[PDB]
Curated annotation (Swiss-Prot), chains B, C:
Component of antiviral defense system Gabija type I, composed of GajA and GajB. Has no detected ATPase activity. Expression of Gabija type I in B.subtilis (strain BEST7003) confers resistance to phages phi105, phi29, rho14, SpBeta and SBSphiC. Expression of Gabija type I in E.coli B (strain ATCC 11303) confers resistance to phage T7. The record marks 94, 97 as: Interaction with GajB. Changing residue 35 to A: Retains endonuclease activity. Homotetramer. Forms the core of the anti-phage defense complex. Interacts with GajB; 2 GajB dimers dock at opposite sides of the GajA complex to form a 4:4 GajA-GajB assembly (GajAB). GajAB interacts with Bacillus phage Phi3T Gad1 protein; this interaction forms a 4:4:8 GajAB-Gad1 complex and leads to GajAB inhibition. It comes from the Bacteria. It comes from Bacillus cereus (strain VD045). ATP binds at residues 32-36. This is Endonuclease GajA. Disruption phenotype: When this gene is missing the Gabija type I system does not confer resistance to SpBeta in B.subtilis. The N-terminal ATPase-like domain seems to have lost ATPase activity, but may still bind nucleotides. The C-terminal Toprim (topoisomerase/primase) domain probably has the endonuclease activity, but when expressed alone (residues 348-578) has not activity, showing it requires the N-terminal ATPase-like domain for function.
Length: 43, 145, 145
């Protein structure tokens, strides 16, 4: 857990999913510089 | 029996829209454009599981309650002699049709807000003329639609 | 002014129950016999948000579903021009009451199972006499009660 950080993504509507992508990419850019980030996107 | 038209006034992102229809309808468009809000205007008109909760403040156009919500659906009944769904309509609405060969029918919804109760009541009407809609009879939680 | 009597004629646990009441009343007893179905008889009469879902098959006595659910509440309006709540009742009831009996009020609930759509519809009536109870008028989802 000191190496890999896993971000699992599973989803009015439409823009909330893109806003969740912006939140997940902002958290991966900010809080996870020292980790290897693996995205797991489900549909 | 055929769907002909729907007219939506002051419901969510629709200020005044008029859409001709049919039996088979396919709705498409962009994101945040109102495809789900178009289908929920049919849910408030015809489905009794949503109509019993009433309207909130957020169901009004740009959130102000000084304008009433009016949704009118038009049906065509020109094939009464061949279709059984037309007789399924006419056997419940046996008093409100005006002329002897009335081929149109109108099912309408009106809603006016109450600021003290903070509640939006839904009143439904039907008939054959647009200026002579009568109230739907009902007893308890069941009306005739 | 004062609650006098409740009569639960058919409900979940009750076969024929007639309880004298008052203002400020406390119900107690053993476990698993009643006394939250007593409180559900008052939520089905006077609370709109419990009343709007109707009755199921399990709300009838011993799942018999051929009897009529009837819940009658008697109110005593003997004191006039002393309490504001009696004027609050009489200004909404209009003239369903009679000047021969200007002292008692009956708010009743009746329910019969449809047994085709599988739904028990709740029809509410109010009146000054126990025979000849007329229906409570309502416009949309809003009752006069
Ligand atoms: N009361 C209202 N007044 C004004 N605009 C409203 C109101 N309620 C919703 N909207 C607008 O409608 C949008 C939501 O529309 P809706 O969810 O129907 O879109 P959609 O086309 O079904 O989206 P998608 O296909 O991307 O799921 C909101 O983002 C807002 O712009
Ligand atoms: Mg949508
Ligand atoms: Mg209990």
């Amino acid at each position: 857990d000191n190496v890999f950080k896993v971000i699992y993504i599973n989803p009015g509507d439409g823009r909330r999913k893109m806003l969740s992508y912006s939140i997940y990419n902002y958290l991966a850019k900010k809080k996870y510089e020292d980790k290897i980030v693996i995205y797991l996107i489900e549909e | 029996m055929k769907f002909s038209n729907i007219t939506i006034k002051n419901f969510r992102n629709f200020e005044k829209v008029n859409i001709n229809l049919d039996n088979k309808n396919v709705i498409f468009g962009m994101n945040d454009i109102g495809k789900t809000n178009f289908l929920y205007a049919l849910r408030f008109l015809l489905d009794k599981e949503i109509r019993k909760f009433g309207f909130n403040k957020s169901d009004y156009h740009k959130h102000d309650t000084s304008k009433k919500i009016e949704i009118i659906l038009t049906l065509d009944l020109s094939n009464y002699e061949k279709d059984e769904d037309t007789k399924k309509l006419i056997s419940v609405v046996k008093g409100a049709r005006t002329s002897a060969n009335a081929d149109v029918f109108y099912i309408a919804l009106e809603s006016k807000y109450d600021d003290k109760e903070l509640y939006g009541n839904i009143i439904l009407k039907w008939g054959s003329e647009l200026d002579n809609l009568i109230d739907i009879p009902g007893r308890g939680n069941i009306n005739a639609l």
